[PDB]
């Protein structure tokens, strides 16, 4: 139900940095990010309209660690909701509990944050939630339970979050190891390079 | 045999408009004048004149804006073979409101826009755009 293979292979195939590692080292220092994985990765072949759409869909899935069945349900909910389909799709993805943990800087990586959630170390509104896909509503306070405040993973992840750009739709309190989900992020609040209309067109077909 | 005079009225308009005609003349009738009045109010034509009593003939003045026909698409929707009646909430919007739909309501002949304001359905005489 997860991907347990090499992380940098996914980033190399997509050509960009998927933030699958904590970022202590530069991405090019650990792999040839400009070259695709495999024997024939040095060559750069053509890519059709379906290829770029599939690559964009695989990009966001591998960013948030979501398989196809779970991701497809997100598209149906996004297309069912009011307003923009692509913006809702990113908002639904960004609202995942593990994503909120990673964005608030409790886990160095979303995969690490996924493990933190699964091991019953994340308390949402005083309630232990270990479901990675569990959605976080605005004005909800997530926190590290006192039993998990002795782990060095939480302490180390705070420094990495400080170096990274701090989201404007979230509130972080590293002293208390708790955060507040202020609001749903907008399209501008996220990375512009990600394309959502390609995903919408791909899932329409 | 001429089994639809209303469609013939539209055909004369469409043929004359495409042939860069100055005016189109046709036999007149009570319904034709009502239709021609609606077109003039919306500005799809300039003016209509009715001449004669024993054998009335309707005269229509066509409109050209910039070397081009103003009436680009005039279509007979309801026909004697297949009558078309729509309710107020089913009234079509031609070109998302840019065009008009001549609707025969119980209070007379008007456009689809007026019919929605008056809350009246009826027979869709033609589409004008």
């Amino acid at each position: 139900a997860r991907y347990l293979g090499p992380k940098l292979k996914l980033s190399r195939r997509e050509g960009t940095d998927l933030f699958l590692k904590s970022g202590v080292r530069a991405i090019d220092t650990k792999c040839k990010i400009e070259q695709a994985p495999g024997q024939h990765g040095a060559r750069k072949p053509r890519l059709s309209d379906y290829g770029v759409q599939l690559r964009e869909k695989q990009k966001v899935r591998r960013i948030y660690g979501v398989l196809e069945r779970q991701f497809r349900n997100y598209y149906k909910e996004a297309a069912r909701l009011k307003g923009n389909t692509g913006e809702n799709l990113l908002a639904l993805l960004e609202g995942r509990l593990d994503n909120v943990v990673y964005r608030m800087g409790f886990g160095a990586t979303r995969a690490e944050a996924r493990q933190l959630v699964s091991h019953k170390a994340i308390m949402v509104n005083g309630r232990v939630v270990n479901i990675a896909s569990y959605q976080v509503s605005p004005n909800d306070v997530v926190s590290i339970r006192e039993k998990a405040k002795k782990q060095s993973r939480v302490k180390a992840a705070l420094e990495l979050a400080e170096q990274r750009e701090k989201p404007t739709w979230l509130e972080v309190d590293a002293g208390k190891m708790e955060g507040t989900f202020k609001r749903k992020p907008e399209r501008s609040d996220l990375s512009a390079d990600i394309n959502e209309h390609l995903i919408v067109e791909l899932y329409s077909k | 045999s001429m089994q639809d005079p209303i469609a013939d009225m539209l055909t004369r308009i469409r043929n004359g408009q495409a042939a860069n005609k100055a005016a189109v003349t046709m036999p007149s009738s009570k319904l034709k004048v009502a239709i021609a009045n609606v077109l003039k109010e919306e500005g799809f034509i300039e003016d209509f004149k009715v001449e004669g009593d024993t054998k009335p003939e309707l005269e229509l003045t066509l409109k050209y804006f910039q070397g081009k026909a103003v009436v680009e698409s005039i279509q007979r929707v309801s026909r004697p073979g297949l009558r078309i009646y729509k309710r107020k909430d089913e009234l079509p919007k031609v070109m998302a409101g840019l065009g008009i739909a001549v609707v025969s309501t119980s209070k007379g002949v008007m456009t689809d826009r007026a019919a929605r304001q008056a809350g009246l359905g009826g027979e869709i005489i033609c589409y004008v755009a």
Partner: protein
């Protein structure tokens, strides 16, 4: 400055007494994304040569299309020799939902949200011509307010 896309490449052939002579034909579409789009049909013997010819033809012979913030003013029907093309304005966030040939034309023209369908023959050169024909005859609310004697308020607000 303006976006350009290659749609189709085909290998054509002619017969001479010596033998068969081959060539490559490339269909491209260009546009600025702000309501201007043109299509070009290059014809050479080498594929890189043909695509450059198509871009040169497409760069000129452009048309101007009114766009309502990335969508069509009203649903329209584009018709060419064999292809029937139906295009329809869509809400914000729907994206370009059209065929392979139609999608390229609408992207370079600046159309972002649109519902489109192709009927009849789907030959790429005929489809793009119908799409170009279907967009050039589309009239903005100002244009219909110009032909008729009413202002924009009377056309739509009334």
């Amino acid at each position: 400055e303006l976006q350009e896309k290659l749609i189709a490449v085909n290998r054509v052939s002619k017969t001479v007494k010596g033998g068969r002579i081959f060539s490559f034909t490339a269909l491209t579409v260009v546009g600025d994304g702000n309501g201007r789009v043109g299509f070009g049909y290059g014809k050479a013997r080498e594929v890189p040569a043909a695509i450059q010819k198509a871009m040169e033809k497409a760069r000129r012979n452009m048309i101007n299309v009114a766009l309502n913030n990335g969508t069509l003013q009203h649903p329209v029907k584009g018709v060419h020799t064999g292809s029937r093309v139906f295009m329809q304005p869509a809400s914000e966030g729907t994206g370009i939902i059209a065929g392979g040939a139609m999608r390229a034309v609408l992207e370079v023209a600046g159309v972002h949200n649109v519902l489109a369908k192709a009927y009849g023959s789907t030959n790429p050169i005929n489809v793009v011509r119908a799409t170009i024909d279907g967009l050039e005859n589309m009239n903005s609310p100002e244009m219909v307010a110009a032909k008729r004697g009413k202002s924009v308020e009377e056309i739509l607000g009334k």
